[PDB]
């Protein structure tokens, strides 16, 4: 099958090597698995030394981490929008490591509401469609929450518009072909601005 030896290559002087030996059990290769977003599907493979690996064919969720706060919540993936390697990979909605994706902001918004008592990214006030208020059963919370707000700080202007739409850009930091997991963190700041500048021009 596929071989990963360097014997069949040609030396740096241009000389052509001669036949030495047949292909060996080690130095082998395996068929690549092209991960796509869809309902979950994972296959098992028995690798060297009796261990096992996981070929991921279709995934729909994975862990993504918010940097400054430090929270990781499981959510669903909307689509992939950029990949530094090949453009044809991007649109076909195939997922690998270091792929820029777009994610749903509902779990992060709800956690933000629970941890901090302030609303984040709400321009629906013009519609007043989903206005609702629930009486909060305490008074000790305000000193703690206002202390957190006055100490930690405020979010940068770029990120609230993304939360207003409910979709955020992120970069995959996991190995889908190796571990069968799509993991990453939401990207922000000047590193975000580089991608936004490149994405639409």
């Amino acid at each position: 099958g596929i071989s990963r030896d360097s014997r069949h290559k040609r030396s740096h002087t241009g000389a052509k090597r001669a036949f030495y030996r047949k292909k060996r059990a080690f130095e082998l290769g395996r068929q690549p698995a092209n991960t796509r977003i869809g309902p979950k599907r994972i296959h098992i493979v028995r690798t060297r030394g009796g261990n096992h690996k996981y070929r991921a064919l279709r995934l729909d969720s994975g862990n993504f981490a918010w940097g400054s706060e430090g929270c990781t919540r499981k959510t669903r993936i909307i689509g992939v929008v950029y990949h530094p390697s090949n453009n044809e990979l991007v649109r076909t909605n195939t997922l690998t490591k270091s792929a820029v994706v777009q994610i749903d902001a509902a779990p992060f918004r709800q956690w933000y509401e629970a941890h901090y008592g302030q609303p984040l990214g709400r321009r629906r006030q013009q519609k007043q469609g989903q206005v609702v208020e629930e009486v909060k059963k305490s008074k000790s919370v305000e000193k703690k929450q206002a202390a957190r707000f006055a100490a930690h700080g405020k979010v940068d202007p770029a990120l609230e518009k993304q939360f207003e739409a409910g979709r955020l850009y992120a970069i995959i930091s996991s190995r889908p072909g190796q571990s069968g997991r799509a993991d990453g963190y939401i990207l922000e700041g000047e590193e975000l601005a580089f991608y936004q500048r490149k994405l639409h021009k």
Binding site: H12, P84, H152, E191
Partner: protein
Amino acid sequence: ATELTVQSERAFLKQPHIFLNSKVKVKSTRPGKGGRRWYKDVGLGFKTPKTAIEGHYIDKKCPFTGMVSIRGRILTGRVVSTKMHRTIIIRREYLHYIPKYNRYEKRHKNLAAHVSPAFRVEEGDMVVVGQCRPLSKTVRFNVLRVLPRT
């Protein structure tokens, strides 16, 4: 070296596991711990160049601000080509002894090494190289110090 800009490529280059966008600001002397540029010292009485400390270049093959360690044999040679990108070719000369004729003859070999953007190397310069892990098909050495020219 002379580099016009640091980000002139399709992807974004950054040092791994170096957090760069932190809400709280803390000033620390440590290179990588506080959140600013990271660097260390290889050892063997080799001093980190000054240009590295304040430089902005990103390199995964430089012995400084990189993920490569210098270990193994240390060699010397004569530089013959420095006109390609981030790679140099060195020539080393020696004398072989023929026992039957009771006298020597000269021989030479060619070597390929990776040059960091911290140094600026031109033709006819003295260099010292150290062994490292395979960086390419035929690149296994890294430059550490350039001696002043005659």
